[PDB]
């Protein structure tokens, strides 16, 4: 696979351009996960090619352009369309939120259209620029605290501020279940309240397995948060009007989908006539 010429291109506004790309097998371009107006053609010498004309260049075009092998190995080109009517390349809201499972390098994808633009990183409400390295093709990459950030640039003569990004690092750790009941021995027609508490993880799954479950109206557990710093999430299972058969094994199996740590504690609750 090859292209003319590569690797990074800086084009003029509203101007025209042609990108070619050939390989032994069929070839196609793809901008934003979806292939645009192309013009595939096969050579008599067993060579497939593909061309796509970029007409009326506008900043909004700036970005990654690939060339694949269809009807993991490809060639990406980056094109900059310096457009003074375009500040930071607008991006998805799902991009504005950066959720993390662990401590790692982060990228704040705020990009410009002109490679010669001075882009700085700031905390939403902060003036001083932060010492993080900038890559006009990807943005700022570094380590951050869970706060909000914005980028700043000087287009024309006016300062522009991108949207605000939010870093959020999830709370994860080992899982240990702590089950208990108001009383393991209850009388018929009374309340069966069990409390499954787990601390450490923010987002955890709760699964209650009990006697009155299979073939019989199940119960809806009610979760609750004790503390918010060291996550103390509690799930309680309440069974008013305790019928019999309720006597048995009540197990709370807790798992966190972030990783997949599992844990389960059980207790036995008897009901007397």
């Amino acid at each position: 696979v090859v292209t003319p010429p590569g690797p990074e291109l800086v084009l003029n506004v509203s101007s025209t351009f042609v990108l070619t790309c050939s390989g032994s097998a069929p070839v196609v371009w793809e901008r934003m996960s979806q292939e645009p107006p192309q013009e595939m053609a096969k050579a008599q010498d067993g060579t497939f090619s593909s061309v796509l004309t970029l007409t009326n260049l506008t900043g909004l075009d700036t970005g990654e352009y690939f060339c694949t092998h269809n009807d993991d190995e490809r060639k990406r080109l980056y094109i900059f369309v310096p457009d003074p009517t375009v500040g930071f390349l607008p991006n998805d809201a799902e991009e504005l939120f950066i959720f993390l499972t662990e401590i790692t390098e982060i990228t704040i994808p705020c990009r410009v259209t002109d490679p010669q633009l001075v882009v700085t990183l700031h905390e939403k409400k902060g003036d001083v620029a932060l010492p993080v390295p900038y890559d006009h093709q990807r943005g700022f990459s570094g380590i951050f605290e869970d706060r909000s950030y914005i980028c700043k640039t000087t287009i024309g003569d006016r300062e522009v501020d991108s949207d605000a990004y939010y870093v959020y690092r999830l709370q994860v750790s080992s899982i240990n279940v702590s089950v208990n009941a108001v009383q393991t021995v209850v009388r018929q027609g009374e309340n069966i309240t069990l409390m499954c508490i787990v601390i450490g993880n923010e987002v955890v799954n709760f699964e209650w397995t009990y006697p009155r479950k299979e073939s019989g109206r199940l119960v809806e557990p009610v979760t609750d948060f004790l503390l918010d710093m060291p996550y103390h999430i509690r799930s309680i299972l309440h069974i008013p009007s305790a019928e019999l058969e309720d006597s048995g094994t009540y197990t709370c199996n807790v798992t966190e989908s972030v990783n997949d740590h599992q844990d389960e504690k059980a207790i036995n609750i008897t009901v007397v006539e």
Partner: peptide, 8 residues
């Protein structure tokens, strides 16, 4: 019903 999420 469960705690497998966050709200923003």
């Amino acid at each position: 019903t469960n705690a497998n999420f966050l709200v923003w």
